[PDB]
Each structure stands twice: as C-alpha cells, then as structure tokens.
Design a protein around this ligand. Structure first.
Ligand SMILES: C[C@@H]1O[C@H](C#Cc2ccc(C(C)(C)CN)cc2)[C@@H](O)[C@H](O)[C@@H]1O
Ligand SMILES: C[C@@H]1O[C@H](C#Cc2ccc(C(C)(C)CN)cc2)[C@@H](O)[C@H](O)[C@@H]1O
Ligand SMILES: C[C@@H]1O[C@H](C#Cc2ccc(C(C)(C)CN)cc2)[C@@H](O)[C@H](O)[C@@H]1O
Lengths: 133, 133, 133
C-alpha cells in the first residue's frame, strides 16, 4: 500500500469543550487502507491555532485511536488575557503499533480553562506506515 | 532511490516582504532525484525564528512547489510591540502528489503586518517519498 | 528492519544547565537495531515544555549523536519575567547519514539565561530509516 497517509482541513468549528472532541476532517481510516499491523508514525500539525478566553487561554491537542488518546500536549499564553491572542504553532508526534487493535487515527482537542479553540486555516494529520516484515 | 530528502540552512537574509518569497537553501529538487510520481510527506521545520515590527509581528511560512503554495501558516506575538521578540518554533507538514506536475519543493515566507523576518540558526525542509507501487 | 524508531517519556527532571545534557528517555539505539548505514529523518517533539527564570526564559533543544549536536534551536518568552510561563510547543527535524559513524540519537537540552527547564508530559524522539539500496 502507499505508506504515506494524510488528511488536511482549512478550518474547523469554534469549539469550547471540557473533554477531548474530534477535530472534524483530521481522521485517517487505517483499516480502510488494509493496514492491520506494523507501526504508524503520526504527526498532528496545527501550525496556526489560537485560543480566546479570560484565564491564560490555550488548547490541549491529542492523537487518538479507536482505543483512546495515545499522546497529548498543549500551548498556553503567558498572560491572563493576552492583548491579542497570537497564533501558536503546535505539532505532536507519536508512533503507534497497528497490531494492538488500531483501525483509525484522529486529531482531538479540549479547552484550557474554558478557552474557545480556533483553527481557521491549514492543519493536517499525517502518518507513515512501517512494517518489520 | 533514497526515500529521504533534506535541505538545511544556518541562516537566511533578514527579509521584509508583502508576498511569499523563497527562503534561500530550503529547496528540494524532486525531478533531479528521478522522482516523477507517488507522494512526498514534506516538513518545513523553522525551530527558532523571530519577527520584529511595530504591529503584532509574525511570519507566514509556506510549502510551495513549481505549481505554487500547497500549505501555509503563521506564528504571531500576543503584544503590539513585544518587550523582546522571543523565538517562536514553527513546523508545517503537508503531503503532495508528485504525479500532479511537481518537480521541486521549497520553503517560503511573507511578513505579518510589515515584520522583518529572521532565521539566524538551523532550519530544514525534509521529505519522505512514498509510492503505491 | 522496522524502518520506524521511537522513544517517548511522560516527564523529565527539572534541569538548570549551561551545557547540553541528555533528556533521559529520549534516546534511540541505532547500532542495537542493526542500522549501520543509510539516512535517519529524526524528529524531536517536545509539545508542552516551559521554562522558569528571571531573564527572558527559554530552552535550547538539540538532536545529538555519539559525534555531537547535529541540529539545535530554542523557544524564548517575549517578557523578562512572564506573568505565567506558558507552554511553548517545540519540534526539531534533522536528517543524519548513519554511514558517518552514528550508533545512537538522543534529545538534549540547555538553559536559556539560567532557566529551569520543564518537561512534565508527553515528549518523543522519532526516526524513519531510509536507504539508497
Ligand atoms: C486572532 C488573530 O489572527 C490573525 C490572523 C491570521 C491569519 C491566519 C492564517 C493565515 C493563512 C495565510 C495561513 C491562511 N490564510 C493568514 C492570516 C493574526 O494575525 C493575529 O496575530 C491574531 O492571532
Ligand atoms: C531576538 C532574541 O534572540 C535571542 C537568541 C538567540 C539564539 C538563537 C539560536 C541559538 C542556537 C543555539 C540554536 C544557534 N546558535 C542560540 C541563541 C533570544 O535569546 C531572545 O529571546 C530573542 O529572541
Ligand atoms: C506552568 C503552567 O502549566 C500549566 C499546565 C499544564 C498541563 C500540561 C500538560 C497537560 C497534558 C494533558 C498534556 C498532560 N496531562 C495538562 C496540563 C499551564 O496550563 C499553564 O499555562 C502554565 O504553563
């Protein structure tokens, strides 16, 4: 199979969430590609996000499979209410064993301290497929 | 062919530009490597840039081919005139079909709100070649 | 061999250092995997670091082999003493010739202006192995 997988978006809804929720469009269907084992290096690339809020805003991002979150991180501003919420590039890299029950990979996000989360431009979820055989 | 491509620099000129312009040295010649089809996962990695200016400075970065920009994003500061313009790591990831007429990939940049753009250390443009055959 | 290598951590010690020192756990043993030539695309992904200090704090990060640093960069805050030291995602990408004497790859860090360096969540060092043969 093509060993490179990719999904990209030019925007997402403006979301406020206390729990991880799917970023629509950042989804790789691994099972649909016939990939049932080996490893995937997965990159979640959100180069131009921002967060608005009243209390040191930010966004948690995760890579999740059907089995749940495999990796996560966040950016946060260094002011309680920034003068202007600047664009804070974010990248997350994880390697996943597909033989462990993985059928899909997706990007998720969750609010820091009740922030509104913003993706209004290019963002991507990428994967490279490696096998030992 | 080697499926890993890479170009790196330790500096660029200080540029002010209203339009995307080439970051000298961040250029992959795909055609020269004999790669005429398949997909390239391309990473533009500018880990230590800064921007100076008078109006919430920042830099737009793009991945471009001979056919134009395929992906772009930016970082911006959260103050009109930051006390000190800190280093703002930036990464951009895109996957490109080479069979669509691609002969080269390059990194580009453009000013946010008339910023001077600064790369004065390591930066890289990387690609991994994948084929379905 | 599996062409994907990966090491990840959920925390590191709090370190103050004027010199590059190893981030424990971010280490790929290339020689142990039987990889004695070709190229490695290496990604150091520290999505959620922060630095505390008195003088525009930050962290230098490097990719190093047994032969020393191959690439480095940093993030820094734009205030002398930030109100709150926010999370500053950081990614570094380098491609390395393994035939040049490389047996391991590791992530390193060093203080900016006497900062305490913080990793208290997921971080990763990843590599994809490419050969021309
Ligand atoms: C919330 C504010 O958003 C503004 C923007 C933007 C913007 C994002 C993306 C683009 C692409 C070229 C990547 C897509 N067309 C272009 C403009 C910032 O300038 C401010 O600092 C601040 O964060
Ligand atoms: C504009 C100012 O630039 C200063 C720098 C730097 C600097 C960059 C790169 C390096 C490498 C090790 C990566 C290359 N040698 C070392 C020092 C910052 O400390 C300030 O916060 C601020 O942004
Ligand atoms: C120093 C302060 O650290 C705080 C944090 C955090 C935190 C980091 C990681 C997580 C994961 C979900 C990724 C891991 N569980 C969750 C909370 C920030 O909110 C402040 O802005 C500020 O930087």
């Amino acid at each position: 199979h093509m060993p490179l997988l990719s999904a990209s978006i030019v925007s997402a809804p403006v979301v406020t969430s206390e729990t991880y929720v799917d970023i629509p469009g950042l989804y790789l269907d691994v099972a649909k590609a016939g990939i049932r084992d080996g490893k995937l290096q997965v990159i979640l690339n959100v180069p131009t996000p921002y967060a608005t809020g009243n209390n040191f805003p930010g966004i948690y991002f995760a890579i999740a499979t059907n089995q749940g979150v495999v990796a996560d991180g966040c950016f946060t501003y260094s002011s309680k209410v920034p003068e202007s919420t600047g664009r804070m590039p974010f990248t997350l890299v994880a390697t996943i064993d597909v033989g462990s029950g993985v059928t899909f990979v997706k990007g998720q996000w969750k609010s820091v301290r009740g922030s509104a989360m913003h993706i209004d431009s290019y963002a991507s979820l990428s994967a490279i497929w490696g096998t030992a055989a």
